[PDB]
Design a protein around this ligand. Sequence first.
Ligand SMILES: [Zn+2]
Ligand SMILES: [Zn+2]
Lengths: 107, 237, 378
Amino acid sequence: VLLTNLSEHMPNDTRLQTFLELAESVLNYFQPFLGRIEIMGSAKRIERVYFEISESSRTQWEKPQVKESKRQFIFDVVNEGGEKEKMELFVNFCEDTIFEMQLAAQI
Amino acid sequence: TMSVLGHYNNFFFAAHLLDIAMGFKTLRTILSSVTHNGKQLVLTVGLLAVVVYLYTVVAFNFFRKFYNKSEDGDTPDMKCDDMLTCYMFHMYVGVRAGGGIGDEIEDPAGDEYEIYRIIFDITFFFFVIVILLAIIQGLIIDAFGELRDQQEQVKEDMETKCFICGIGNDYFDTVPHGFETHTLQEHNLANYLFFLMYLINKDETEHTGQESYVWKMYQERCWEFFPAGDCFRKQYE
Amino acid sequence: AYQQKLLNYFARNFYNMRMLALFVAFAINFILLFYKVSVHYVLEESSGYMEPTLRILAILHTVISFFCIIGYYCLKVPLVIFKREKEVARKLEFDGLYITEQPSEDDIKGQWDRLVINTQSFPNNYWDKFVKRKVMDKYGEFYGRDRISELLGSAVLNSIDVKYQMWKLGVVFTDNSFLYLAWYMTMSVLGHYNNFFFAAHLLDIAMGFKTLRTILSSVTHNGKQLVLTVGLLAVVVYLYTVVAFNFFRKFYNKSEDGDTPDMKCDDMLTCYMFHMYVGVRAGGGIGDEIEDPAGDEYEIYRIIFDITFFFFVIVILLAIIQGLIIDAFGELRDQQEQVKEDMETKCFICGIGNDYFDTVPHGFETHTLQEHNLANYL
Ligand SMILES: [Zn+2]
Ligand SMILES: [Zn+2]
């Protein structure tokens, strides 16, 4: 995570680039696992936050019906969604789909 | 409960086949091809109920003597004049004709009403059979074009603007092969789902500072935290 | 006091006064479903007082159709008459049409309003009573100072401006909406004289149900080219009934077999009436209702006459009026797609576009709801 954060905050350091490509085998292990987003963390320059994607909830996102529900959501927004409610709908997508997988993980 | 009645009678048991309303995924599109335009469907047919009713008013005075379901008058001659059953004639026959209602009626052969008979019947063939059924023809067809458009809107506004950041395709073509990266690394919707998992999955003591921020922002439902315009690339150089 | 106070009821109640008129027109005509002959008669498989409720409701309907248009006379009539004064007023100010342009013979709507400008009352419903003097002081010394001032200027019987009021109703009568409701009321009049043509009020559904107006608009916004297509079909069929008028005259038998007093429908009037009552209306082309050939010299010419008539009329021309209506959907759907695209792109006044207001977080919504927000300019 940190090496990603060193890079993606501060690139173009050959010093780091040597060091990072030496850490290669690690990064490849965690590229499925490291999640990464963007938010506006009160400095209002946009930070990026790195986190851990759990492997259960990783896999469960793609497979069956969430896959259908994902593009279902997108057609819920691009067809009928307004501007304000777009991000507000979004978590309403998410929280449901979060709860879906939490069921589908404990199966 | 239809399966219940199968043990009581194995016939109405087989009306389970309207699971095909919500069964085969592919077929659901073709039944959606109506019901997303179906509200104005009914009123069109409701229009056809009314417009046909006005033709069965005209015949109720003017062309009463032309109704013979019966053979010739030789039989105990049914002349279908009663406004109830006359309107039921125009729907069981005149709507359902294929050739207008002047196919199943005493077609005129020299009457004073012959000019008024044909003009009654040419228009009924047009205004009902030709034009109104073509509505419910085309109404269903627009529903295709109404749904096809929407699927065209998706894969256009997904490819233009990255979903959260509102940007557009153009800005991320500066980077080589970039928009794909921006949609698969920088926002990549699932991560905001996954991040949101990460927060719910942990305790508020266990939050990092960025995350304890966010959590406060989230329970507030204040939604500033999602990047509106200025996603990370556009913040810098 | 009651005549002006209850006046304000009808204008208040009007869309309920007009829709409820249609719902009464439902239940009446739901009972014109129950007629039969014997002399015309009303069979009752119901309560015995149903024909009094028809006498109740039909009088009630004509009551509604009178008391509602009084509300129409104070709801939309004033708005229309606002608009008509407006057009004249600004065109005196900015065109000076009754000074200079002297309006053309078409749109006598324009020519109708010549009279009213002499009146004192002229801009009543325009909230802007300075129109008349302004035109004087724009066009006095140029054309005539008091030539134009000449152009402009028990107790109830002479308190009102007659010339204004005669002008007013003249515009009121030429309203298509007022003439409609008048045409709706005169059908209610004849309900007291005959309770049958009374029920042709149901073409209020032309302007009644909001949702249904779309589906009738689905034709009439493409309806100008509709008629000429059918007008084409009138002509193309006429050319087929010319061909048969020479070449296939002997094939027309509405009559059984020649055994009957054999009607051979050769007369070009009634032959063209055959091709429309049958050949247009076939379902299977006109070669269904005709002596189909069985070995004739003309058999090759018979089928080729009839294959083409099945295509060029039944297949292709009716599909036009099929598709013409269908394009009208796609013509209207597009327009509603243009709205919600050019509303969301460009803010209406400022012409800008969506892009500029995405710089600000969540911005375009703000720009359309705070910075211009159409209603504020209203
Ligand atoms: Zn984005
Ligand atoms: Zn603007």
